[PDB]
């Protein structure tokens, strides 16, 4: 934070930042790809959801762990 | 003793300057901004760690 007021740029000798105009063009070109899944990645996710479904429903409490695991979690991931 | 300092203060009340001051104030706005130096880092780095390590034991 002290280096913020010494200059007007944070990183030093390890990194150069990306300007946003060039950044969004690389984003927008990446927006026109539409990747398609495969069958081996289908196999890896299913039992991994059984990992999530099993250990979420062994607590059922108001503890530090949250209550329920939705199927929308798999919809996101 | 504190009441004494209250006492003669209000009594002399009912029986360098302000307009010089605001001249000295508004002059400093357009030409007096400063810039941080190397000596400004070394004290407050040591000091702010004390502000996190021991003030949390009080407030």
């Amino acid at each position: 934070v002290t280096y913020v007021h010494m200059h007007n740029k944070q990183p030093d000798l390890d990194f150069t930042p990306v300007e946003p105009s060039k950044m969004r063009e690389y984003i927008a070109y990446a927006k026109t790809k539409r990747p398609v899944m495969s069958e081996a990645v289908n196999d890896y996710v299913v039992q991994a959801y059984i990992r999530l479904r099993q250990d979420s429903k062994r607590e059922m409490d108001s503890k530090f762990s949250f209550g329920q695991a939705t199927p929308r979690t798999l919809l996101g991931i | 003793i504190r009441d004494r300092s209250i006492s003669e203060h209000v009594l002399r009340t009912h029986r360098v300057t302000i307009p010089f001051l605001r001249k000295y104030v508004q002059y400093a706005k357009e030409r007096v901004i400063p810039q941080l130096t190397q000596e400004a880092i070394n004290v407050i780095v040591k000091n702010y760690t004390d502000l996190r390590n021991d003030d949390n034991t009080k407030k």
Side-chain angles (χ1 to χ4, degrees), chain A residues 1-2 12-13 19-20 24 31 33-35 38 41 52-54 56-57 60 64 68 72 76:
Chain A
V1 181
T2 55
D12 196 3
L13 297 173
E19 65 272 16
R24 295 173 297 172
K31 290 177 70 68
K33 298 295 181 182
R34 191 176 293 110
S38 69
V41 301
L52 178 63
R53 178 66 71 192
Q54 186 177 2
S56 177
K57 290 178 175 180
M60 298 177 188
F64 293 157
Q68 298 88 22
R72 287 178 180 170

PDB file of all heavy atoms in Angstrom, chain A residues 1-2 12-13 19-20 24 31 33-35 38 41 52-54 56-57 60 64 68 72 76:
ATOM      1  N   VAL A   1       0.831  -1.201   0.000  1.00  0.00           N
ATOM      2  CA  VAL A   1       0.000   0.000   0.000  1.00  0.00           C
ATOM      3  C   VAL A   1       0.869   1.255   0.000  1.00  0.00           C
ATOM      4  O   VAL A   1       0.511   2.282  -0.587  1.00  0.00           O
ATOM      5  CB  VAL A   1      -0.965  -0.043   1.199  1.00  0.00           C
ATOM      6  CG1 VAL A   1      -1.872   1.176   1.246  1.00  0.00           C
ATOM      7  CG2 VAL A   1      -1.794  -1.307   1.138  1.00  0.00           C
ATOM      8  N   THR A   2       2.041   1.182   0.631  1.00  0.00           N
ATOM      9  CA  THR A   2       2.947   2.326   0.614  1.00  0.00           C
ATOM     10  C   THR A   2       3.556   2.539  -0.762  1.00  0.00           C
ATOM     11  O   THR A   2       3.918   3.668  -1.111  1.00  0.00           O
ATOM     12  CB  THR A   2       4.050   2.147   1.653  1.00  0.00           C
ATOM     13  OG1 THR A   2       4.722   0.900   1.432  1.00  0.00           O
ATOM     14  CG2 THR A   2       3.470   2.191   3.058  1.00  0.00           C
ATOM     15  N   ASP A  12       6.546  -4.778  -9.915  1.00  0.00           N
ATOM     16  CA  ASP A  12       7.951  -4.408  -9.976  1.00  0.00           C
ATOM     17  C   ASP A  12       8.763  -5.616 -10.411  1.00  0.00           C
ATOM     18  O   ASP A  12       8.880  -6.588  -9.657  1.00  0.00           O
ATOM     19  CB  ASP A  12       8.431  -3.914  -8.606  1.00  0.00           C
ATOM     20  CG  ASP A  12       9.748  -3.172  -8.678  1.00  0.00           C
ATOM     21  OD1 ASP A  12      10.279  -2.980  -9.790  1.00  0.00           O
ATOM     22  OD2 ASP A  12      10.258  -2.784  -7.607  1.00  0.00           O
ATOM     23  N   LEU A  13       9.282  -5.566 -11.639  1.00  0.00           N
ATOM     24  CA  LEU A  13      10.299  -6.454 -12.203  1.00  0.00           C
ATOM     25  C   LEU A  13       9.874  -7.914 -12.331  1.00  0.00           C
ATOM     26  O   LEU A  13      10.706  -8.753 -12.692  1.00  0.00           O
ATOM     27  CB  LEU A  13      11.608  -6.404 -11.402  1.00  0.00           C
ATOM     28  CG  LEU A  13      12.291  -5.041 -11.411  1.00  0.00           C
ATOM     29  CD1 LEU A  13      13.480  -5.031 -10.469  1.00  0.00           C
ATOM     30  CD2 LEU A  13      12.710  -4.681 -12.822  1.00  0.00           C
ATOM     31  N   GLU A  19      -3.385  -4.179 -20.521  1.00  0.00           N
ATOM     32  CA  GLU A  19      -4.315  -3.085 -20.741  1.00  0.00           C
ATOM     33  C   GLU A  19      -5.687  -3.644 -21.117  1.00  0.00           C
ATOM     34  O   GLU A  19      -5.773  -4.690 -21.768  1.00  0.00           O
ATOM     35  CB  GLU A  19      -3.776  -2.145 -21.829  1.00  0.00           C
ATOM     36  CG  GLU A  19      -3.660  -2.739 -23.227  1.00  0.00           C
ATOM     37  CD  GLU A  19      -2.332  -3.435 -23.471  1.00  0.00           C
ATOM     38  OE1 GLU A  19      -1.611  -3.729 -22.493  1.00  0.00           O
ATOM     39  OE2 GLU A  19      -2.005  -3.688 -24.649  1.00  0.00           O
ATOM     40  N   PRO A  20      -6.778  -2.997 -20.686  1.00  0.00           N
ATOM     41  CA  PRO A  20      -8.101  -3.630 -20.812  1.00  0.00           C
ATOM     42  C   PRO A  20      -8.628  -3.702 -22.230  1.00  0.00           C
ATOM     43  O   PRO A  20      -9.386  -4.631 -22.531  1.00  0.00           O
ATOM     44  CB  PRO A  20      -8.997  -2.743 -19.939  1.00  0.00           C
ATOM     45  CG  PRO A  20      -8.334  -1.419 -19.957  1.00  0.00           C
ATOM     46  CD  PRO A  20      -6.860  -1.697 -19.995  1.00  0.00           C
ATOM     47  N   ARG A  24      -9.974  -7.246 -23.517  1.00  0.00           N
ATOM     48  CA  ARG A  24     -11.338  -7.626 -23.868  1.00  0.00           C
ATOM     49  C   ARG A  24     -11.432  -8.213 -25.266  1.00  0.00           C
ATOM     50  O   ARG A  24     -12.337  -9.010 -25.543  1.00  0.00           O
ATOM     51  CB  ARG A  24     -12.249  -6.414 -23.765  1.00  0.00           C
ATOM     52  CG  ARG A  24     -12.380  -5.881 -22.374  1.00  0.00           C
ATOM     53  CD  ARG A  24     -13.142  -4.604 -22.430  1.00  0.00           C
ATOM     54  NE  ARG A  24     -12.411  -3.607 -23.198  1.00  0.00           N
ATOM     55  CZ  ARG A  24     -12.926  -2.436 -23.539  1.00  0.00           C
ATOM     56  NH1 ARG A  24     -14.160  -2.147 -23.167  1.00  0.00           N
ATOM     57  NH2 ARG A  24     -12.219  -1.566 -24.244  1.00  0.00           N
ATOM     58  N   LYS A  31     -14.927 -15.771 -26.807  1.00  0.00           N
ATOM     59  CA  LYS A  31     -16.367 -15.938 -26.681  1.00  0.00           C
ATOM     60  C   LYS A  31     -16.987 -16.638 -27.881  1.00  0.00           C
ATOM     61  O   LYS A  31     -18.190 -16.916 -27.871  1.00  0.00           O
ATOM     62  CB  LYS A  31     -17.039 -14.582 -26.476  1.00  0.00           C
ATOM     63  CG  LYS A  31     -16.768 -13.958 -25.129  1.00  0.00           C
ATOM     64  CD  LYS A  31     -17.409 -12.591 -25.031  1.00  0.00           C
ATOM     65  CE  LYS A  31     -18.920 -12.710 -24.959  1.00  0.00           C
ATOM     66  NZ  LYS A  31     -19.368 -13.336 -23.686  1.00  0.00           N
ATOM     67  N   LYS A  33     -16.026 -19.706 -29.356  1.00  0.00           N
ATOM     68  CA  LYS A  33     -15.375 -21.003 -29.471  1.00  0.00           C
ATOM     69  C   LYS A  33     -16.343 -22.167 -29.345  1.00  0.00           C
ATOM     70  O   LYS A  33     -16.360 -23.041 -30.220  1.00  0.00           O
ATOM     71  CB  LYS A  33     -14.265 -21.123 -28.418  1.00  0.00           C
ATOM     72  CG  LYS A  33     -13.171 -20.092 -28.592  1.00  0.00           C
ATOM     73  CD  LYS A  33     -12.440 -20.323 -29.900  1.00  0.00           C
ATOM     74  CE  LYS A  33     -11.314 -19.328 -30.097  1.00  0.00           C
ATOM     75  NZ  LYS A  33     -10.632 -19.533 -31.404  1.00  0.00           N
ATOM     76  N   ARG A  34     -17.165 -22.182 -28.288  1.00  0.00           N
ATOM     77  CA  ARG A  34     -18.101 -23.240 -27.911  1.00  0.00           C
ATOM     78  C   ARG A  34     -17.407 -24.599 -27.836  1.00  0.00           C
ATOM     79  O   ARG A  34     -17.501 -25.401 -28.774  1.00  0.00           O
ATOM     80  CB  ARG A  34     -19.291 -23.284 -28.872  1.00  0.00           C
ATOM     81  CG  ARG A  34     -20.441 -24.174 -28.410  1.00  0.00           C
ATOM     82  CD  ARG A  34     -21.604 -24.091 -29.368  1.00  0.00           C
ATOM     83  NE  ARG A  34     -22.207 -22.765 -29.346  1.00  0.00           N
ATOM     84  CZ  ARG A  34     -22.133 -21.896 -30.348  1.00  0.00           C
ATOM     85  NH1 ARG A  34     -21.468 -22.214 -31.450  1.00  0.00           N
ATOM     86  NH2 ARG A  34     -22.711 -20.709 -30.242  1.00  0.00           N
ATOM     87  N   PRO A  35     -16.641 -24.863 -26.781  1.00  0.00           N
ATOM     88  CA  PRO A  35     -16.035 -26.186 -26.622  1.00  0.00           C
ATOM     89  C   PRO A  35     -17.087 -27.245 -26.328  1.00  0.00           C
ATOM     90  O   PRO A  35     -18.140 -26.983 -25.746  1.00  0.00           O
ATOM     91  CB  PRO A  35     -15.080 -26.000 -25.444  1.00  0.00           C
ATOM     92  CG  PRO A  35     -15.690 -24.906 -24.652  1.00  0.00           C
ATOM     93  CD  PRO A  35     -16.327 -23.981 -25.644  1.00  0.00           C
ATOM     94  N   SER A  38     -16.332 -34.484 -23.781  1.00  0.00           N
ATOM     95  CA  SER A  38     -15.961 -35.796 -24.294  1.00  0.00           C
ATOM     96  C   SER A  38     -16.586 -36.849 -23.384  1.00  0.00           C
ATOM     97  O   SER A  38     -17.384 -36.527 -22.497  1.00  0.00           O
ATOM     98  CB  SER A  38     -14.431 -35.928 -24.401  1.00  0.00           C
ATOM     99  OG  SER A  38     -13.825 -35.961 -23.121  1.00  0.00           O
ATOM    100  N   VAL A  41     -14.346 -37.423 -19.794  1.00  0.00           N
ATOM    101  CA  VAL A  41     -14.656 -36.411 -18.799  1.00  0.00           C
ATOM    102  C   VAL A  41     -16.066 -36.588 -18.260  1.00  0.00           C
ATOM    103  O   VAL A  41     -16.377 -36.083 -17.178  1.00  0.00           O
ATOM    104  CB  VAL A  41     -14.453 -34.996 -19.377  1.00  0.00           C
ATOM    105  CG1 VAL A  41     -13.018 -34.821 -19.844  1.00  0.00           C
ATOM    106  CG2 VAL A  41     -15.426 -34.721 -20.507  1.00  0.00           C
ATOM    107  N   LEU A  52     -19.486 -35.688  -3.564  1.00  0.00           N
ATOM    108  CA  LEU A  52     -20.133 -34.522  -2.975  1.00  0.00           C
ATOM    109  C   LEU A  52     -21.466 -34.881  -2.332  1.00  0.00           C
ATOM    110  O   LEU A  52     -21.795 -34.375  -1.253  1.00  0.00           O
ATOM    111  CB  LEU A  52     -20.333 -33.445  -4.039  1.00  0.00           C
ATOM    112  CG  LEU A  52     -21.042 -32.170  -3.574  1.00  0.00           C
ATOM    113  CD1 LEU A  52     -20.237 -31.452  -2.499  1.00  0.00           C
ATOM    114  CD2 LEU A  52     -21.341 -31.247  -4.746  1.00  0.00           C
ATOM    115  N   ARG A  53     -22.246 -35.747  -2.982  1.00  0.00           N
ATOM    116  CA  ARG A  53     -23.581 -36.066  -2.486  1.00  0.00           C
ATOM    117  C   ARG A  53     -23.524 -36.863  -1.186  1.00  0.00           C
ATOM    118  O   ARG A  53     -24.395 -36.709  -0.321  1.00  0.00           O
ATOM    119  CB  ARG A  53     -24.355 -36.825  -3.569  1.00  0.00           C
ATOM    120  CG  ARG A  53     -25.756 -37.266  -3.180  1.00  0.00           C
ATOM    121  CD  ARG A  53     -26.693 -36.091  -2.957  1.00  0.00           C
ATOM    122  NE  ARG A  53     -27.055 -35.405  -4.194  1.00  0.00           N
ATOM    123  CZ  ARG A  53     -27.667 -34.226  -4.237  1.00  0.00           C
ATOM    124  NH1 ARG A  53     -27.976 -33.596  -3.115  1.00  0.00           N
ATOM    125  NH2 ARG A  53     -27.972 -33.675  -5.402  1.00  0.00           N
ATOM    126  N   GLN A  54     -22.477 -37.664  -1.001  1.00  0.00           N
ATOM    127  CA  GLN A  54     -22.418 -38.539   0.164  1.00  0.00           C
ATOM    128  C   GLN A  54     -22.003 -37.778   1.419  1.00  0.00           C
ATOM    129  O   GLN A  54     -22.645 -37.897   2.468  1.00  0.00           O
ATOM    130  CB  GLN A  54     -21.460 -39.692  -0.111  1.00  0.00           C
ATOM    131  CG  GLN A  54     -21.413 -40.740   0.968  1.00  0.00           C
ATOM    132  CD  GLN A  54     -20.499 -41.885   0.596  1.00  0.00           C
ATOM    133  OE1 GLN A  54     -19.871 -41.870  -0.462  1.00  0.00           O
ATOM    134  NE2 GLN A  54     -20.418 -42.884   1.465  1.00  0.00           N
ATOM    135  N   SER A  56     -21.966 -34.534   2.039  1.00  0.00           N
ATOM    136  CA  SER A  56     -22.788 -33.390   2.418  1.00  0.00           C
ATOM    137  C   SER A  56     -23.970 -33.816   3.271  1.00  0.00           C
ATOM    138  O   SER A  56     -24.417 -33.057   4.138  1.00  0.00           O
ATOM    139  CB  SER A  56     -23.281 -32.657   1.173  1.00  0.00           C
ATOM    140  OG  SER A  56     -24.137 -31.582   1.523  1.00  0.00           O
ATOM    141  N   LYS A  57     -24.480 -35.023   3.046  1.00  0.00           N
ATOM    142  CA  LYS A  57     -25.668 -35.513   3.726  1.00  0.00           C
ATOM    143  C   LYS A  57     -25.338 -36.450   4.879  1.00  0.00           C
ATOM    144  O   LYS A  57     -26.130 -37.349   5.183  1.00  0.00           O
ATOM    145  CB  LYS A  57     -26.590 -36.202   2.718  1.00  0.00           C
ATOM    146  CG  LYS A  57     -27.257 -35.234   1.744  1.00  0.00           C
ATOM    147  CD  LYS A  57     -28.117 -35.974   0.738  1.00  0.00           C
ATOM    148  CE  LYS A  57     -28.892 -35.038  -0.175  1.00  0.00           C
ATOM    149  NZ  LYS A  57     -29.731 -35.802  -1.144  1.00  0.00           N
ATOM    150  N   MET A  60     -26.104 -32.858   8.343  1.00  0.00           N
ATOM    151  CA  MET A  60     -27.510 -32.461   8.515  1.00  0.00           C
ATOM    152  C   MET A  60     -27.704 -31.489   9.676  1.00  0.00           C
ATOM    153  O   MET A  60     -28.733 -31.520  10.356  1.00  0.00           O
ATOM    154  CB  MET A  60     -28.419 -33.681   8.697  1.00  0.00           C
ATOM    155  CG  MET A  60     -28.443 -34.641   7.528  1.00  0.00           C
ATOM    156  SD  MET A  60     -29.487 -36.054   7.923  1.00  0.00           S
ATOM    157  CE  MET A  60     -29.164 -37.120   6.529  1.00  0.00           C
ATOM    158  N   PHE A  64     -20.612 -25.446  11.180  1.00  0.00           N
ATOM    159  CA  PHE A  64     -19.838 -24.664  10.219  1.00  0.00           C
ATOM    160  C   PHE A  64     -20.062 -25.119   8.786  1.00  0.00           C
ATOM    161  O   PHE A  64     -20.027 -24.290   7.870  1.00  0.00           O
ATOM    162  CB  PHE A  64     -18.348 -24.769  10.552  1.00  0.00           C
ATOM    163  CG  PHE A  64     -17.961 -24.121  11.854  1.00  0.00           C
ATOM    164  CD1 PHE A  64     -16.813 -24.527  12.518  1.00  0.00           C
ATOM    165  CD2 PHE A  64     -18.752 -23.134  12.431  1.00  0.00           C
ATOM    166  CE1 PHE A  64     -16.450 -23.951  13.721  1.00  0.00           C
ATOM    167  CE2 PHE A  64     -18.392 -22.551  13.634  1.00  0.00           C
ATOM    168  CZ  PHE A  64     -17.240 -22.963  14.280  1.00  0.00           C
ATOM    169  N   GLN A  68     -27.305 -28.360   2.748  1.00  0.00           N
ATOM    170  CA  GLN A  68     -27.733 -29.240   1.667  1.00  0.00           C
ATOM    171  C   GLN A  68     -26.861 -29.019   0.440  1.00  0.00           C
ATOM    172  O   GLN A  68     -26.260 -27.951   0.287  1.00  0.00           O
ATOM    173  CB  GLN A  68     -29.212 -29.005   1.330  1.00  0.00           C
ATOM    174  CG  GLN A  68     -30.180 -29.300   2.484  1.00  0.00           C
ATOM    175  CD  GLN A  68     -30.406 -28.098   3.393  1.00  0.00           C
ATOM    176  OE1 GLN A  68     -30.203 -26.954   2.992  1.00  0.00           O
ATOM    177  NE2 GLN A  68     -30.799 -28.359   4.634  1.00  0.00           N
ATOM    178  N   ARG A  72     -28.070 -28.252  -8.592  1.00  0.00           N
ATOM    179  CA  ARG A  72     -27.596 -27.063  -9.291  1.00  0.00           C
ATOM    180  C   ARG A  72     -26.100 -26.851  -9.106  1.00  0.00           C
ATOM    181  O   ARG A  72     -25.475 -26.147  -9.908  1.00  0.00           O
ATOM    182  CB  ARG A  72     -28.368 -25.832  -8.821  1.00  0.00           C
ATOM    183  CG  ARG A  72     -29.791 -25.780  -9.334  1.00  0.00           C
ATOM    184  CD  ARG A  72     -30.531 -24.563  -8.810  1.00  0.00           C
ATOM    185  NE  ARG A  72     -31.899 -24.512  -9.315  1.00  0.00           N
ATOM    186  CZ  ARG A  72     -32.826 -23.668  -8.880  1.00  0.00           C
ATOM    187  NH1 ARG A  72     -32.539 -22.806  -7.915  1.00  0.00           N
ATOM    188  NH2 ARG A  72     -34.045 -23.698  -9.396  1.00  0.00           N
ATOM    189  N   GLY A  76     -23.667 -26.058 -12.205  1.00  0.00           N
ATOM    190  CA  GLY A  76     -22.638 -25.049 -12.331  1.00  0.00           C
ATOM    191  C   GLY A  76     -21.296 -25.618 -12.733  1.00  0.00           C
ATOM    192  O   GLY A  76     -20.658 -25.105 -13.653  1.00  0.00           O
TER     193      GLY A  76
END
